[PDB]
Amino acid sequence: RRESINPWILTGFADAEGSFLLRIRNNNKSSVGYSTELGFQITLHNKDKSILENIQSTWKVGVIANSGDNAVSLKVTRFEDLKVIIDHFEKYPLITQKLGDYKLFKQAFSVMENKEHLKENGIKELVRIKAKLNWGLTDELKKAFPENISKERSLINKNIPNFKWLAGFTSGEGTFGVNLIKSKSKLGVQVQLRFSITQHIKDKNLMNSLITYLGCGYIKERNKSEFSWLEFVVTKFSDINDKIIPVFQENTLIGVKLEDFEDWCKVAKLIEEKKHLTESGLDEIKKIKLNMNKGR
DNA sequence: GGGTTTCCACTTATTCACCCTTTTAG
């Protein structure tokens, strides 16, 4: 752990990458036949381990471990430590549908705080809570509690609270790219800066507000077969240079994605100076693109 | 102790990120 993370940036990053967990596990050693585990977790690629360590030192809770060969995770399940998680998301609330999952996390916390999870009465309530959380109930767990159990919950419809949140959220779902377009120009290569944010259609309302909230961009309806998601995209350079860049200069990104923004800004300064029309500039832009994003 | 909590190892599905070329605008 090194530095601390702004609380609203943390909530925005949690809106993007965090997830709440509730385990209801068969257990022959448990008086009620089941044991439980409640908490919150973030799984990232190895290269962003510094974010996990910064979150850990901000909250002073959580356990960092490997998550396969290429990922690393921060998990909070120590029950007393979950109070920190509750206190944070009460002061700095989530604004995506994940708020719904967090609200269920809170109900489960109340049950385990009353120690009711050690009685069949509490287990049954935890099953009702888990039925509306994330993937919901497995077929086995559903058959183990025959009663009628609702799986539906209230949709979340909230607004971007501030740029600090947007910087956290963008550090997760954002991308700063450079399109090399084969154009009918003299150089034969048009340089195009592209900024975009991706999100499932379950939060269409939040995605469309980005247009209004940022004063630029458009929405693209995408789908890979049976799956749908949205993509907010800005390609006009004046918007990128006047509206997108300054927002993130003043609300600093986190993770390696910050380096991608810094490099993205160099290309922006080149364009701004028209150096992107000279061949020496084009070669500098190619060098930058090669060493950012995957190429880094 | 023994029932309960906490942690580490590891997997799985799809929502992301990040990429491309072609077409149209101005």
Add this chain to the structure above:
DNA sequence: CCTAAAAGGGTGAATAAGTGGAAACC
């Protein structure tokens, strides 16, 4: 003609969520 802007996408893997196993605590 010329450059910027948008359109129209392709797709692998970093995410979100998850289970198995057990040391260890109260």
